[PDB]
Write a protein that binds this ligand. Sequence first.
Ligand SMILES: *[C@@H]1O[C@H](CO)[C@@H](O)[C@H](O)[C@H]1NC(C)=O
Ligand SMILES: O=N[O-]
Ligand SMILES: [Ca+2]
Length: 496
Amino acid sequence: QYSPNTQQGRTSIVHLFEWRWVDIALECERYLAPKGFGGVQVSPPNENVAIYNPFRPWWERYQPVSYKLCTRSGNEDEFRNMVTRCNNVGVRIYVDAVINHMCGNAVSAGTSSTCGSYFNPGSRDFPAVPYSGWDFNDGKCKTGSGDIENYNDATQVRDCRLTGLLDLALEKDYVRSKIAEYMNHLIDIGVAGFRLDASKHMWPGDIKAILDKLHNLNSNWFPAGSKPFIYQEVIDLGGEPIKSSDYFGNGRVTEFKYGAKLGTVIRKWNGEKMSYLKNWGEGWGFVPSDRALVFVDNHDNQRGHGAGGASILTFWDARLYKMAVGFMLAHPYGFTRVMSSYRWPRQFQNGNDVNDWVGPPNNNGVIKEVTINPDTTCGNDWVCEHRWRQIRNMVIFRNVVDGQPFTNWYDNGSNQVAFGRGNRGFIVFNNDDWSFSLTLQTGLPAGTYCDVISGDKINGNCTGIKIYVSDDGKAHFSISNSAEDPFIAIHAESKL
Ligand SMILES: *[C@@H]1O[C@H](CO)[C@@H](O)[C@H](O)[C@H]1NC(C)=O
Ligand SMILES: O=N[O-]
Ligand SMILES: [Ca+2]
């Protein structure tokens, strides 16, 4: 469950947050495949609560009503159509599995759901699954409110309602089977793995039991015996009884400390600086690289809805964001996930963003399609960070240097650092307030390379800056602290 099951040469997955199935299908064919992306993390494909207060917020998708693959992103067929089409072009589909709970216990009963299924949070009836009061942790939870109250009590964190969400009795074979039933359907459709949402709120043992029920990937597309990829959503920043290591027996875990400390460093907060990144990875209290699913930001914290808090960088900080991602995408630690967002009317008051609830672009609740601008950017308010040259090109960089060790590290003792990945790649950063002009050992083969950040290698030429590597691997670099993109990236496949 540790292997992403991407096909050799693909090393990242993009979170096409709130994208419809038809749009993702097209993206696999038109961009993801030819650009070498490994897979797509999709929003919960199961029926959820239709919330109108606020209007169609993005979080209404983490409030399940049934397991019908029928949401704002599309019905079951469109999902199949997507999974097939993406697989046929070597691009995987990872499902955001919301299996810890159903909806808010206070949500009105009725048919206010994405597929119309009737449900009753009050009487705990989700006849579409079906689930009854026998399937929830009401009796098991020992808190006075019934919800999670104190994170220092590892039991209540798992047995009580996460902010009011009805907690499924995951120790019951019946519930385990209804979830596995949901996940295997998806597996047999061709999905390559899952994001186990709210894993901290699930017992490592209960998750295990649910995985023992899981099939092996669809043998039409995957090697026989392919276990689905599993990355548990667990927010562990230390100082809490629950550790992410407790979930290593079930697969990978999101390393939330990653984007938190990376944003702290890049933002140069509390005295932190890039030169500290030399021992990036485990040396920072992060989980083992082979157990880490890393990312700069995620749909939650890019809104202040998650771990990392204030230091987290997002597309809103576009300049430092490309730099943050550039480093993540060049560093060998973990399996990388690129965020792909949409613009929302963000507006701060007294420090918080009051529009963080705003769902994806839409017309009367109907998610707007992703339009592709002539310059490959997206319209309809989709940010499409994965289409930004500096990101998309660093996505390719990771594939090209895949396997190569981390070496030839350089730092000025401040914020201009550089390192290489074997003899296949080299990247330089300058986050200081002054120009960086120095000849560095790149460990690369002599020749002329295209800087993939400022430009691209096209027709046997570079559209942007060019680096010249000498017979001794040496190469001169020059980045102005006021440069549009304060970092240069060259690799084997950008060589003229
Ligand atoms: C590279 O670009 C130059 C113009 O800057 C052009 O003369 C040359 O033919 C190009 N090389 C190839 C291989 O197309
Ligand atoms: O929540 N996924 O990192
Ligand atoms: Ca729970």
